[PDB]
């Protein structure tokens, strides 16, 4: 047990191992039953709603790629040469996840769109082949 | 400009008999006509509004049908309380005379 | 239950002016159920010629709309109350003639105690008692 | 054989109502000066609007049964009410005024419109009194029976002075549906406001809907595209307002020639009442000018489009508002924080059988009851300097008269009052639908 | 790319192909961090909560039928003769989805209930057979 | 049909059969479009947010164990002797679910943690074997 | 009063205490607060010892 | 005799719409709603 964000400076392998620790603390915090319009209750309601919607957006992004409920999901889109092409051993043994995000920050959106298209296409293919 | 015309002027009938009288218009007024009841010495009271819809208080014996230019008002199972004067109404236009139901 | 009460019968002379009041009460306070939403039509009933429409007054801003035959000689004013559940409607006919003798009715368009009939202004249920104006010499 | 196949994200919507939040351009508001319609609180709109055309889509629209206009009316009322909450309450200002007419350099047009009223108003110390004077318009003071006067709205409502820094300038606001809801925009150039719309588009936000409050004229508004459009709930019904839309500008240039000066009077511990102290220069009547040829034309287009509904052999006549309050019998609008009530009798007064400018005299009021709220009024503070406006008459709110039984003429007098009709001319093309992305369809598939 | 609701008037096949475009824009809109009690912030909070709960209801309806994370899901309940029995080619080549919803608008609830029962029954069957 | 919580006093087998009835009524209640700051609208907004976040927490707990969208899910963690060791027939024929919760109330958290660890480990194993 | 020509005086409630009470500012779920444990921190630049609270 | 002294006809001076003018009005207050100050003076 390394705690929340414990493997932030660790290797991407260890972070992939401990993903569940970060996954648990994404929706529930320390946040009595009644709602008040003082400053603190107001901010509390705002924080609850913000956490709910952010977690739901992340979950929707997972689900529409056909990876709902999976911490590690395998997809069908290859890696283009435009995206980072550094060695597998170096990425998975000599990196932290923060550096990897900093490196491929741009490109996120096109990768997501390719994931959407591939998921929809394979859904159509599965529906067509299952009808036989 | 609508020339509402209601006929006949009077309609004598017996108790329980059904009566009918029409309010002929000049142009197309769809179903925007209303029917009223003017008892002698009393204020007018609405009978049928929007052509076919029935007023809540009055029984279902009062029925009004029609679409376009010619509209029909029917009073089935006449009773001594229905003896009054009736007239149609399309927006601000009223018939010149109206129909007066009397007892045979 | 909106009730409309008018003024007493008046006997005038040709060239005079008559002002018939119309007290309305029981409309309600909530928007769409208040006196500032339901027009007060003024209907003239000449004995023999049937009913005649003279004009309507919308009590929110006093927007009036007179019939063509009466333009220039009829004026409508309001006295909408504070709670807007009641009010008073006036009509002045400033050029009375011998053919203007009739019974004048003020009417509204609220059939039911729980319906918003603001936009249906021609279901004239709440007729007033009737002010018998007699214009003769 | 057939088996149920559930599809998520189908392009299916149903008619429904929802809460439409606000979005506005950052550059629209100065970011330094507040607004009566709060624009800072609105989310920043996207620089590039995302309008998606829908082909083969016919949807039934109804501008007269649209919840968008009612929601906007409620929003504007709430904004106006909450803008006046922190402002000064002018309850001490109801005193007995010793008013005398201003006869210093006044033209005959405004001989008695202005009254120099001297009264006694509490200072910061409640045990000491102050004798101050102010210039009140005739419409803002009613005589009590020099003479004795009082505010016109002092036996019916409590006066709350509008905050001098809060601007009344209309700023465009985009009404955006929440996620899961879509706003359908009708791109048909000849849309009567009711019935199917062959060209239906989908937007996430509406266009820039300027909350311009006005009567008898739609100022600074959205135009028609092909022709002048006459749109009414029921053109046969004379009780329904007739909304007209102009395809070309009708520029109206307002001005307030008096150079008013604002004098701050301390009416309490920290409260200041701004009064019209003096006017530097000549006294002239406020007026609005409308090009004569441009109007007479625009009226020609209007009568040409109006003759369609009533027949080609009717004598269409326009006339001036008969009866009503000042908010209906005159063109009421707001020009730079000062409220104008202009006699639009010259604009109308015309009969249409089958360089010059029109000057409309205007009257200024400071005690304003905008939404006819019971027990609530507003005192518009004086605006320093000369006020000028250049607005566009983009529409009309007409009203047919009535029981012309055999007469061939049809008279159309102006008149507004209901601001919901004013804001219906902007939301006629918009419609809110609720996305139902879950659907079941039959296929030959079989779950394992 | 046809945009949001782009294939509304298109054939049900094209709409089934482009489902993902409508699926993306169901939770996130144009809707700074702080919460205010002016009219606009109030309406903004209401809109956020409404979108969140509607998306969650749709996702729950998908999940309890065993179709979570799937845009096109195959089920085990047949089509009764009471429900619309028009030809497969006509439905999938001559229809829009709006017309199809208008046609079967009433039989929705019973179809949903049959889906619930079938999903629960096959969950029990899978649990029983997996114990062997 | 036994209704919401109909099989509360019924055998755990019947409750496992009727799980879907309780599952349906966890997010949507009887809870017009506009938001008001009176007491009732305030409490209504609080109730909506509370229901949303509670359902989302339950769904997240289901998903991070690799059981998203499944009413009955089979896992890989055995039962320790510390936890209740009563007979299978007695548990599944002579019990209600309330009694079973009362019996194993404590222990919930460690069972959940074992589920997290097993799910993450088998995700890693599946990703590793699928790369071959 | 000194503040009587500029502001309106509101008397503080005698039962409301002005005693400072510690308050912990907590981030919502999905947000983390990074605490810099460096004992010589100039307030700007990298922090070698970063903790999460 | 049951309600001999329960009702009190109280006349007082109340501000009108103009704060510089006063109004003399009267009202009927129940005995439980008024307390004497030491016709007599009540509040
Ligand atoms: C423009 O002008 C037209 C014509 O006047 C208006 O259309 C009418 O609108 C009224 C309501 O405002 C409609 O009246 C209602 O009719 C119902 C029955 O209608 C059905 O059956 C008739 C049979 O001939 C059909 O023609 C019609 O299409 C319908 O299928 C009644 O059930 C209603 O009564 C109930 O509602 C009213 C109102 O709340 C209550 O007061 C009653 O107590 C009752 O609960 C009602 O009478 C009328 O039918 C419409 N005529 C049509 C559609 O041609 C337009 O509304 C008006 N404005 C617009 C926007 O176009
Ligand atoms: C719509 O157009 C019509 C026709 O132009 C217009 O009618 C006219 O209105 C004016 C103003 O209301 C009337 O003028 C008044 O007439 C009365 C007698 O009937 C006079 O006593 C009035 O005197 C004024 O001037 C005096 C001296 O300065 C003042 O002491 C006094 O208070 C008045 O201000 C004044 O002349 C005019 O008679 C009618 N004539 C018609 C019917 O043609 C109508 O007002 C317009 N409606 C609007 C503007 O909404
Ligand atoms: C709204 O605008 C209307 C149009 O401008 C205004 O109508 C005018 O109102 C004034 C009073 O405010 C009337 O004035 C009187 O008119 C009579 C008639 O004389 C006229 O003709 C003679 C020559 O025959 C001429 O010398 C006069 O100057 C007049 O033009 C005079 O005898 C009176 O002294 C007085 O001037 C106007 O007649 C009237 N015009 C019309 C076309 O009716 C209306 O008052 C405005 N009202 C508002 C602001 O609500
Ligand atoms: C608040 O104060 C105003 C001003 O005093 C009141 O307005 C005045 O109300 C009276 C009726 O109480 C009006 O009298 C009538 O005027 C017409 C004018 O044509 C006349 O024909 C009648 O014989 C009668 O005298 C008066 O005109 C009106 N004044 C104005 C300037 O509108 C108002 O009623 C008061 N409101 C309340 C709540 O009492
Ligand atoms: C219709 O829209 C026009 C703009 O397209 C509005 O005109 C503008 O009105 C504002 C407010 O009166 C003017 O602002 C003021 O300008 C003066 C001089 O620069 C300045 O001293 C004031 O502090 C204030 O900023 C603005 O100049 C004016 N623009 C034009 C083109 O004249 C008009 O008021 C709108 N009409 C409505 C909403 O009825
Ligand atoms: C609110 O009331 C206070 C107290 O009367 C005002 O403060 C006073 O403001 C005057 C402004 O001229 C100050 O006068 C100047 O004082 C300096 C002192 O060195 C002197 O050199 C100048 O010749 C002149 O006399 C006065 O000192 C000051 N009194 C204080 C601060 O106790 C205040 O300005 C008022 N605020 C307003 C008018 O909104
Ligand atoms: C921070 O980086 C150091 C250096 O890479 C990590 O320490 C090494 O970790 C690996 C894997 O456990 C060991 O095999 C090495 O022996 C460690 N250091 C040496 C001396 O080579 C360290 O673990 C990283 N931080 C965390 C929290 O994992
Ligand atoms: C300001 O207050 C003074 C004092 O009340 C007003 O002047 C007095 O008004 C009364 C009215 O009945 C007269 O009897 C006094 O003779 C007046 N003068 C005094 C007492 O010095 C004055 O009019 C008020 N200011 C206004 C209303 O302009
Ligand atoms: C008055 O109307 C004209 C014409 O509609 C407006 O001018 C247009 O403004 C838009 C936005 O800046 C431009 O895209 C158009 O090209 C302009 N048209 C012309 C012919 O100049 C003008 O802004 C309006 N004035 C207002 C609303 O105050
Ligand atoms: C509106 O039009 C009037 C004329 O109908 C203009 O009046 C003239 O204005 C100039 C410049 O101030 C003066 O020199 C003239 O003497 C005025 N003529 C009259 C008859 O008064 C007025 O300035 C115009 N103003 C606007 C706002 O357009
Ligand atoms: C309004 O009335 C006041 C008087 O009540 C005028 O002020 C006086 O004006 C004369 C002549 O300029 C001065 O001698 C006095 O000292 C002024 N008294 C003051 C300022 O209290 C004022 O000028 C009038 N305003 C207008 C525009 O007519
Ligand atoms: C309204 O005001 C505008 C200016 O704000 C006037 O427009 C100018 O008018 C002059 C004189 O005709 C022309 O030479 C200019 O080219 C116009 N352009 C500008 C400066 O905008 C307009 O004429 C005025 N018209 C009315 C109806 O008063
Ligand atoms: C309206 O009156 C004001 C006040 O006199 C004028 O502005 C002043 O002008 C003089 C120069 O003539 C300057 O010295 C002052 O500083 C100005 N005072 C201010 C800006 O408050 C103004 O110019 C007059 N009319 C207009 C609109 O020009
Ligand atoms: C709207 O309907 C038309 C007619 O069905 C569609 O156009 C046809 O689309 C198919 C499929 O792409 C083509 O094979 C045909 O050649 C097209 N034309 C005809 C005459 O059939 C059109 O695509 C539909 N709208 C959208 C946005 O898809
Ligand atoms: C409550 O318990 C009873 C049993 O005590 C359940 O009903 C049946 O009762 C008979 C009694 O002879 C038993 O033989 C049956 O085995 C019981 N179960 C069944 C499935 O028939 C009863 O169903 C329980 N309550 C609920 C809500 O199910
Ligand atoms: C209402 O106000 C009047 C005027 O202030 C009061 O009358 C005065 O009361 C004092 C009490 O000490 C007497 O000394 C005066 O002689 C009274 N003046 C008169 C009668 O004009 C009166 O008492 C107040 N209260 C009521 C209800 O009358
Ligand atoms: C102001 O004008 C009105 C106009 O009716 C007049 O009655 C009044 O006496 C005038 N006041 C003064 C002092 O000039
Ligand atoms: C409105 O326009 C549509 C066509 O867009 C037409 O079918 C309908 O009859 C028109 N009706 C009215 C009320 O103008
Ligand atoms: C306005 O134009 C019409 C023709 O469209 C013309 O008859 C009329 O005389 C013109 N202006 C006026 C009011 O004279
Ligand atoms: C089902 O819905 C369709 C919609 O067009 C309707 O025509 C039909 O009468 C409905 N019938 C039943 C059985 O609910
Ligand atoms: C602050 O300290 C860091 C080292 O911790 C150093 O890199 C940076 O330049 C310093 N800058 C300032 C503003 O003192």
Numbering used by the authors:
A (entry chain F), E (entry chain B), F (entry chain D): 519 to 549, 563 to 663
B (entry chain M): 1 to 91, 96 to 108
C (entry chain I): 1 to 35, 35A, 35B, 35C, 35D, 35E, 35F, 36 to 52, ...
D (entry chain A): 33 to 138, 147 to 185, 188 to 306, 309 to 321, 321A, 322 to 397, 411 to 504
G (entry chain E): 193 to 245
H (entry chain C): 148 to 185, 188 to 192
What did the original publication write about this model?
In addition to 04_A06, we identified and structurally characterized 01_D03 and 05_B08, two phylogenetically distinct VRC01-class bnAbs also isolated from donor EN02. The presence and length of insertions in the three representative bnAbs correlated with the formation of interprotomer contacts. In contrast to the CDRH1-mediated interprotomer contacts of 04_A06, mAb 01_D03, with its 6-residue FWRH1 insertion, 4-residue FWRH3 insertion and 20-residue CDRH3, contacts the adjacent protomer with each of its heavy chain CDRs and makes potential electrostatic interactions with gp120 K207 and E64 (99.6% and 99.7% conserved). In the 01_D03-complexed Env structure, but not in the unbound BG505 SOSIP structure, EM density was observed for residues 57–65 of gp120 on the adjacent protomer, suggesting that this normally disordered loop becomes stabilized after antibody binding. Like 04_A06, 01_D03 contacts the adjacent protomer, likely through its FWRH1 and FWRH3 insertions. The four-residue DASG FWRH3 insertion is situated in the same position as a WDFD insertion identified in the 3BNC60/3BNC117 bnAb family, which arose in a different individual. In addition to contacting highly conserved residues, the insertions and interprotomer contacts of 04_A06 and 01_D03 contribute to an increased amount of surface area buried on Env by antibody binding. These insertions enable 04_A06 and 01_D03 to bury more surface area on Env than 05_B08 or other VRC01-class bnAbs, presenting another possible mechanism contributing to breadth, potency and resistance to escape. Consistent with this and in common with 04_A06, 01_D03 exhibited greater potency and breadth than 3BNC117 and VRC01 (GeoMean IC50/IC80 = 0.052/0.187 µg ml−1, breadth = 92%/88%; 245 strains). In each structure, R71 of the heavy chain contacts D368 of gp120, a feature typical of VRC01-class antibodies and a hallmark of CD4-mimetic bnAbs12.
